[PDB]
Amino acid sequence: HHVHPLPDSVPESEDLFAPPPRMQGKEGRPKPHIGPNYESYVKEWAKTVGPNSDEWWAAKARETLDWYDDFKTVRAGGFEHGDVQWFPEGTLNAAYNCLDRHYYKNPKKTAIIYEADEPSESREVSYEELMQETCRVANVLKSYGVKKGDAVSIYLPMTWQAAAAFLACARIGAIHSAVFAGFSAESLRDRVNDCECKVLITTDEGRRGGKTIATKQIVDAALQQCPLVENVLVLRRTGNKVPMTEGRDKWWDEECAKMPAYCPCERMASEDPLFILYTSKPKGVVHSTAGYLLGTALTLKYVFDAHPDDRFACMADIGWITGHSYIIYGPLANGITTAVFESTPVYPTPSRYWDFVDKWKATQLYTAPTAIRLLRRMGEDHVKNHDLSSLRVLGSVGEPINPEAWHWYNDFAGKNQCAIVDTYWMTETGSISIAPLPGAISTKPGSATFPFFGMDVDIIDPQTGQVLEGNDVEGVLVARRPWPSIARTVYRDHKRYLETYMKPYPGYFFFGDGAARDYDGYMWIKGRVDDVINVSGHRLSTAEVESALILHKGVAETAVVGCADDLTGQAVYAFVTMKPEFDLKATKEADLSKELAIQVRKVIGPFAAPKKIYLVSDLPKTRSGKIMRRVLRKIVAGPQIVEEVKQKVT
Numbered sequence: 001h002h003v004h005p006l007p008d009s010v011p012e013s014e015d016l017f018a019p020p021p022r023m024q025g026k027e028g029r030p031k032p033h034i035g036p037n038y039e040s041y042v043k044e045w046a047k048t049v050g051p052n053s054d055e056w057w058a059a060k061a062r063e064t065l066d067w068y069d070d071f072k073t074v075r076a077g078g079f080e081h082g083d084v085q086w087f088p089e090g091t092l093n094a095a096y097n098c099l100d101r102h103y104y105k106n107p108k109k110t111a112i113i114y115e116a117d118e119p120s121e122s123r124e125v126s127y128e129e130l131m132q133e134t135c136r137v138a139n140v141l142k143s144y145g146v147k148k149g150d151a152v153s154i155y156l157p158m159t160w161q162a163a164a165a166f167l168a169c170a171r172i173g174a175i176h177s178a179v180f181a182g183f184s185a186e187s188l189r190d191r192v193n194d195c196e197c198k199v200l201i202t203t204d205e206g207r208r209g210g211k212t213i214a215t216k217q218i219v220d221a222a223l224q225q226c227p228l229v230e231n232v233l234v235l236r237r238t239g240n241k242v243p244m245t246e247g248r249d250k251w252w253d254e255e256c257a258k259m260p261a262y263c264p265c266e267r268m269a270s271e272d273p274l275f276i277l278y279t280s281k282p283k284g285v286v287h288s289t290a291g292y293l294l295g296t297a298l299t300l301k302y303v304f305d306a307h308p309d310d311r312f313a314c315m316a317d318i319g320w321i322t323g324h325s326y327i328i329y330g331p332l333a334n335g336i337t338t339a340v341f342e343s344t345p346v347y348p349t350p351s352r353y354w355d356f357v358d359k360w361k362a363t364q365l366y367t368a369p370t371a372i373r374l375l376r377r378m379g380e381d382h383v384k385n386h387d388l389s390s391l392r393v394l395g396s397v398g399e400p401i402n403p404e405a406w407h408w409y410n411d412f413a414g415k416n417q418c419a420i421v422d423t424y425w426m427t428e429t430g431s432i433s434i435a436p437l438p439g440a441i442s443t444k445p446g447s448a449t450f451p452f453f454g455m456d457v458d459i460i461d462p463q464t465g466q467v468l469e470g471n472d473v474e475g476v477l478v479a480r481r482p483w484p485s486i487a488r489t490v491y492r493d494h495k496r497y498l499e500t501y502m503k504p505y506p507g508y509f510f511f512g513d514g515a516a517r518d519y520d521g522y523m524w525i526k527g528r529v530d531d532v533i534n535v536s537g538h539r540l541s542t543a544e545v546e547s548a549l550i551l552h553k554g555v556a557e558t559a560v561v562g563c564a565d566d567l568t569g570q571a572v573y574a575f576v577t578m579k580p581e582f583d584l585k586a587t588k589e590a591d592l593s594k595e596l597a598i599q600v601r602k603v604i605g606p607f608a609a610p611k612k613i614y615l616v617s618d619l620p621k622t623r624s625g626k627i628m629r630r631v632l633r634k635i636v637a638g639p640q641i642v643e644e645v646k647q648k649v650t
C-alpha cells in the first residue's frame, strides 16, 4: 500500500472498530438515523451529491427548518466568482428556528446546561428562559437603533447569555461578530474596527479556571482606538467594580429590565449574512443564514446521531466556529439540550469533564485533540472511577488526532462502548465536512473516514495540479462543488476569499490541508499543506511524525517543523513535551532523543528521523488549541511559552 494509516501500536488488522452496541439500538438506546453499515451511508450519501441531488436538499431544507417564505431555487453560483447561493428566494430567521419553535412545543425543556466555572453555580436554562432573555437583548439592540444588516461585536466569555447575545443579533437580522474573550485589546480593536460595528456586547469580567478575565478593562483599552462604537452593553457576570463610561456603557440587566420579554423576528433572506467570524491580517469569514443553519442542523443530527432527549456536550468556546456551529446553532436548531461549559478540562481538577458527564448524564461529548492529550498527560484515575455510560458518541475536532490519543479517548472516556467521530472541517466550511456516521462507519484511529452529505471531495497532486484517481492516493484536499454551509465571502475582502480558496486549484475549493485516501476509501487528514516537510523528495505530514513520536513512553505531545538543509532539502526538527512525572535526570536526554529517532524510523522510514529534538515544557498554542508550527518554524529559521522555545533553540 502506498498510503499508510497514522502510526499506531495496534496492528491494522485489529484496528477497525465497528459501531458498538450503544450505537446499534441495543440497551434501550435510540436506533441510529443511518445504519448499520458502510452501504447504508453510501445509499443515503449518493442522494446528496451529483446532478440529481436537488430533490434531497430541497426536502431536507423544508423538513429541517421553519420558513416564512418557501424558496424556489435550490442552489446556484459557484467557486469561480464566489456567488454561491442556496434556497435564495426563501426567508426565515435563525432565532425562530433555534428558540421560538421549540419554545412553542415544550417551553420548559432545557435549552442550555450552563456548567459554571465553579461546579456548584451550574444550572439549567429552559427554552422559555433563553428565549425571553434573547428577546430582551434584541429589544435593547433595537432601542440603540441597530437595524437589519448592521454589525454587532460580541466579546463574551462562556456564560449561557452568550447564546442570547448571538441569537438576539440573529433575531433582528444584525450580523454578530464574536471575539474570543481573552483576546488582547489590540486584537479586539482590529476586529471591532474591521466590521464597523456601532454596538459591542461584553461582560464586566469573565471567569475561567478560577482566574479573572478583565473583559471590560480590555474593552476600554480597545475602544480608545475604535471611533465607531457608540453603545456598550455590559453583562454583570461577576459584579466586581469595573469602569463604566457615562452614556456609552449600560448594564445588561438594567437595560433588559425596561424591555418586553418578546420581540418579533426579522424575516431574513436565505443569503442575508448571519455572522462574521474572524480567524487569526484577521480574516472575517462571512456565513449567510439558511445554508449555514441547515448544514449545522444536519451534521449535528447525523454526525452525532442526535435524538430529541439528548444532552449534547460540546466543550469548545463560542469564540470559535466549533462553538458557533455545535454549541449554539446546530444543537438549538435541532431543539435538544446543549452545554455551555465555562471552565477548563483541569479545573478544579482533571476529573472535571467526567464529573460533568456523570452529573448531567451527557449523551455526546465533543472536544479537541489538545484537551484529550492534556487529560492523557494527567493519568487514568481522574476518569477510571466514573460511570460515563450515558455517552454514545465521542467527537474530536481541531487537528489530526494521534491514534494513541484516539485510543486513550476510546478506552477511558468511552469504555470501548462509544463511537469516536473524528470531525474534519474549518471555519470556512461552516459545518462538519468529513466524519464517520456513528451508527454506520467502522472507524480507524486517526481517520475522518467519509465525506458528509453534500461534500464531494478529491485529492489533487500539488506537484501537477491534477486530480489523483482511485484509492491509495495522497495529496491536497479539494472539494468539487459548493455545499450549503460554505462561507460566502471574507468581509469586505472578496478578492482574498477568491485568492485563498478558489484560485489555487481552479474549479475546486482548496481546504489548505494535506490528505490521503487509503485502499478502503477512508480519508486521512494529515496536517496543513504549509506544514508538510520535504526530506529528499519524501513529503512528510506533521500528523505522521508526531503520531510516531507519541508512541514512545512518557511523551505527552509533540510538534515537528521543517527547516532548510543543504543535503536533504529540508530536515525535520521536533519539539517534544514529556509527561511531568517523567524522570529527565535518570534517562540521559541524548538517549531519549536516540530512542525517539529510532522509533520514527521504524514506523515511517529512515528519512523521517528528526535532525534535532528540543525538549520543552509546552508548545505555542492558540486559545482553540491549534499548535503554532509557523512560530516554531520561524524560531528554527531565525504567550510566555514562545520565549522559552527561542531560548532552548540557542
Ligand SMILES: CCCOP(=O)(O)OC[C@H]1O[C@@H](n2cnc3c(N)ncnc32)[C@H](O)[C@@H]1O
Pocket: 279, 321, 322, 396, 397, 398, 399, 400, 401, 422, 423, 424, 425, 426, 427, 428, 448, 511, 512, 513, 525, 526, 527, 528, 624
Ligand atoms: C473546525 C474547527 C477549527 O476550524 P479552524 O478554521 O480554526 O481550523 C481549520 C483547520 O483545522 C484543522 N482540523 C480541524 N479538524 C481536523 C481534523 N478532525 N482532522 C485533521 N485536521 C483538522 C485543519 O488543519 C483545518 O484546515
